[PDB]
Amino acid sequence: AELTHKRRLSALGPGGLTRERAGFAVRDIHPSHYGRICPIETPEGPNAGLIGSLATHARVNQYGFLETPFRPVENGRVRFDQPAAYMTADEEDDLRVAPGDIPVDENGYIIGPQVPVRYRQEFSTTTPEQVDYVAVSPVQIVSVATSMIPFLEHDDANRALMGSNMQRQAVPLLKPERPLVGTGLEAQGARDSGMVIVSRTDGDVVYVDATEIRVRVSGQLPTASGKSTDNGQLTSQKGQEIRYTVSKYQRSNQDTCLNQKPLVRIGERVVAGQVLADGSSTEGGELALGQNIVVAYMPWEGYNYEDAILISERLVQDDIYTSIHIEKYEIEARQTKLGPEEITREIPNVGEDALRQLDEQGIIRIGAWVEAGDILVGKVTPKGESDQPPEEKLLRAIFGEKARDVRDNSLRVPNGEKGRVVDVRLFTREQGDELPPGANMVVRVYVAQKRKIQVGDKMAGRHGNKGIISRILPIEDMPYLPDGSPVDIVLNPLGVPSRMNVGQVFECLLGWAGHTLGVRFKITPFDEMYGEESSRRIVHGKLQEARDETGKDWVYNPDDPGKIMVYDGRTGEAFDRPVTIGVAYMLKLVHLVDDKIHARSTGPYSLVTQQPLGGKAQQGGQRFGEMEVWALEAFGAAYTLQELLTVKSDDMQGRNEALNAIVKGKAIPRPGTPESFKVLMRELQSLGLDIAVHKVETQADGSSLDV
Amino acid sequence: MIFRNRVVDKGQLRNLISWAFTHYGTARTAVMADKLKDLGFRYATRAGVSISVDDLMVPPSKRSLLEAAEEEIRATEVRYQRGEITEVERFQKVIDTWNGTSEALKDEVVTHFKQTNPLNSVYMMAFSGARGNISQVRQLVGMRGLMADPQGEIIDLPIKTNFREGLTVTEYIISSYGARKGLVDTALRTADSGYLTRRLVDVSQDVIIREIDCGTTRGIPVRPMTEGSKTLIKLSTRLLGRVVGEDVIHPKTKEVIAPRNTPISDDLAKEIEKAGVAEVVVRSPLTCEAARSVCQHCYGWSLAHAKMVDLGEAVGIIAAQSIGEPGTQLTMQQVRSKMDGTIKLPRKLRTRTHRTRHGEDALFVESNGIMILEPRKEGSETPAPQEIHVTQGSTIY
Amino acid sequence: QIMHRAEDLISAASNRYRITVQVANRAKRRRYEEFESAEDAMMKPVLRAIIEMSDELT
């Protein structure tokens, strides 16, 4: 992401456009865009078509205009030996112009009998005479994630978009893993991110302690190349000296987390500015996104039939697919002009069972396990009883004790918070609390948890994808292989042909390989070799030998050029038709049911409408849709409606009435009457309204006091 | 007690379910097509199925029958060169070309499948019934029908293949625009879909049945919706969920029926229209006298009641949503029938007159007419593959 | 069954709503009438309501 978000751009701007009066062309595209910005970038929202992808290669000038190279071809001869190849800034040349690739012979000579190539927004045909500018490379129209697609060459554009924006905001994952399969463009980009650290300078590491790697005050040869051919405003002056601390699991601006990793073992040479730190998601300067997984597509007993992922419990035991998150909680105390209050170290009804793993103000011990409605730390609040509630004075004195309302809304961590606590930053008057004034002392502290994936996890891929899962499953029942291993991701099978995204196969496949013969690829997409379905050629190939040398030579069948067999029914029969399987790059997302859960039974209504309120909170309005109140009358029978407004909206005494009725063994009655109504009526009456609202069976009707 | 044995499809589900619930207590039959339905699964499972790659099969003319089309241009443009006969002109051809041959290209793929694997996955999806359709398969296997550019026309570069081989760059961006278009309005007709049946409900609201007794002899008869040739609407199924007080007089060959009042029910239909008779009135609402409402009797069985609706329901509010709310799917042959360079009578073809100029060169003149079975072009008068001398029209595209 | 063949009674008894409504009317009272936890009423008040309709609805 922080790639991309380095560099989207828009025209939202003070300066920019409306977001609805900037009507259409605004939205479209423009062959300038070709090579200048990527089309696969689009939030597909009411604020989309406004996010310049920034040419994967562009650069810009003092006039802002961006660059997009136009590589010269001396009427038949390119080889990139010619000059220019570095401009077409924001525009062109009125040279009918060479698209990215085309059968580029050895040293250039550029076969295409008669090649199509772009004049200006147009793309006529002409051959080595008249062109000369052409790819740098076969992808000058991408933006950080639209490159992930290993073989988008084989996947529809309308198809490639949100899927390519999935990894754009992927979740991290405790234990990372390069992909498998290879198009490989990125490693570097990972270094651009910063999560991974290259020498600032140089060295050959001494003890590379997890906490402290060092050409730091090493005293050693991370030093010395840390002085390789040394430099001066850099202190080579003494056994070199490149100090900097790695990061643990810190709350990202989105509560995401990552702690990098001491990668390069000791005393093992380095080289300037080469990534040696393994952060979030690289092993080694590559994009750790997902893992690599066998995938037999298979409409089995359902549990998935679009969309609908199924996976085998192993995933959990695999110890992979393990988020972790850590998020603020904080709390503070006022100093009430009502008569100030502090935190406590307790007040009543405190278990020490509550109050225990607590600390010395009330405070909560760190590195301490918490779980559900846990207790942070001890707010102490004011709430006198001047107008002692009717029972009050007595009850108090009647039950038999004289307590006092010194109160305590001390912090109770939300339920399900089974997270060990993991830091705290915290401070009071003294440093000068840099404090929101009127306020006494910071209480911010928080927690994470290792937390493995579950159901409804928006996991999928990186090219036209979006997935969730029912159920997971006994490592055994799930289908397995003639080699004898059990597989670990169904799919459905129809998905993909329909998504018109084919290649997912491809990888499956390719990967297969990988996995069978530890094969790497990191090769730009788009079969351009020879200029046809070489891909194919690849696949079957790297198959071929792989299975040839695989010994069993079953992982491939001449009669199954891309299939496999599927003996593995409920009791492991032979499923029937040899069905294809292989290795995909399942990548999970955030929309975790946890932060995306929601349900509650009433609580605080609003103020104004005094209606409860759903800003997606623990007490979040079951939200509501009148499009349904425009579909809930199609059967009518009021009642639900009647309630269905009332008493859960206006009527106080309704709502409550309810509460009772049930716990009061009473037939919850009869609406209140709404009131918000009355509220609306009030402002109207003032706006200049009048209403006699009234009975009429009454003496000449009248004006029933509905106020 | 009634065994059926054919193949199954979607529809024969569909219907099936019907014919069950049509005579069986809703739940009693609503519960059906659930155990056997979930058994869809477990079988399908057992058969099991999935793609291949070359699942993406390509009817291997494809290479050929394509490059066939390729010469098409060759002449259109490698010969127009003399300007002698001209630019926008055959231009108007070449584009014509591509899509045309193309349909022939498909047409190969059509039969090509048809008899490639009776047990074919790609086929077992679709022509069965499944997520696969025809345009879908086309650009899965068949060449991708040439479309349009960024604006209401098509950039020089056209769509080109199925996937398999994949795509160079050009068309991909060309297509990227295609999407992003699609994108964008996808958005805006959110608004449309929203307003649809929203302000329409605001007029369809407060219409409620009060009255059945309503004495009404008013109403309008139909014929099936009936574009030209084709039976636009079945009617043997369309005229249902309603009643009629003026009855059926088939050629007095038959005997009057559905006396009045008569809850037009199905059989009654399918027969009385497929059987032989073809026209009558009703009793619908644009009639029946009613107070801020419609005569029940001028209603019928709705489209869920499966029987005379009750009364006291804002039918309109629902009658609204049923139109635009789903209409959102608005844009802005398959299951194989005879052939697909489609319907056409005997023996001449349409060329336009300034702007095609290559020779051999023309846009799309309106259909001429007189539907001929097993198409051939523009004429009349009974050809050989099937025999009839009747008619006009053509689901021809 | 627990609830399934109940798709016909309401279906074939003049105004359906109307039915419901009465049926409640049962309901409400025919819980109400007995607040002694009579296990007959251990189950939901409707469903009885229903059924003893049902099987008087012959």
Binding site: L641, T673, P674, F677 | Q205, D206, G312, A314 | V21
Partner: peptide
Amino acid sequence: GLKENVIIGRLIPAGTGYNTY
């Protein structure tokens, strides 16, 4: 108006009572 009373919470017409009356 079903919605007229909806703005309120009178029940609607289009519900037993609208005719049971």
